[PDB]
Amino acid sequence: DWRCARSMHEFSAKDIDGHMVNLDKYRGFVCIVTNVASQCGKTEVNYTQLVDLHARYAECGLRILAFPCNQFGKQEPGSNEEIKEFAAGYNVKFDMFSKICVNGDDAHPLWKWMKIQPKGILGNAIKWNFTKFLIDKNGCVVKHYGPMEEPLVIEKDLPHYF
Numbered sequence: 277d278w279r280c281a282r283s284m285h286e287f288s289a290k291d292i293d294g295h296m297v298n299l300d301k302y303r304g305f306v307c308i309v310t311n312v313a314s315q316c317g318k319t320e321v322n323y324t325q326l327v328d329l330h331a332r333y334a335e336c337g338l339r340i341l342a343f344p345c346n347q348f349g350k351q352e353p354g355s356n357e358e359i360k361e362f363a364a365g366y367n368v369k370f371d372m373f374s375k376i377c378v379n380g381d382d383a384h385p386l387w388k389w390m391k392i393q394p395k396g397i398l399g400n401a402i403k404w405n406f407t408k409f410l411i412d413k414n415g416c417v418v419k420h421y422g423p424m425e426e427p428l429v430i431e432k433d434l435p436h437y438f
């Protein structure tokens with residue numbers, strides 16, 4: 277059961293092209309896992325800064341896993357094909373996944389698990405688009421950045437985990 281997972285690496289997810297991806301392929305890499313939307317007021321700053329972080333630190337082992345999610349103001353209403361094209365407009369080269377739920381019993385189990393990494397049981401629901409979890413090379417959640425935090429806030433924390 278997902279509650280007992282020790283690492284992101286125990287999970288799998290469908291990429292935005294529909295193919296199952298074993299997330300243990302990220303073993304040895306530092307990852308930013310984020311829920312994205314195309315019609316949010318935060319969309320422009322988040323895509324632009326995620327692409328910038330990936331441009332400068334991918335060669336060092338930074339990977340970004342982006343999960344579309346329509347649960348926050350219905351701001352990701354498009355199909356996966358439409359979302360893939362939207363991300364291409366920002367020159368996204370990191371890893372896009374198929375649209376999921378991040379809250380609810382139908383939420384992707386990776387998200388169920390990340391939300392409980394330390395703490396209390398109440399109030400761990402994802403609050404809006406563009407929450408960011410930082411994942412170390414062993415697949416552990418080491419930081420959470422709320423949807424108010426611009427991605428470039430993360431840059432200063434990266435050296436502790438590379």
Ligand SMILES: *CC(=O)Nc1ccc(OC)c(Cl)c1
Binds near residue numbers: 335336337438
């Ligand atoms: C891109 C990259 O690998 N940079 C880099 C430089 C120096 C160190 O050692 C501190 C590390 Cl882990 C990564």
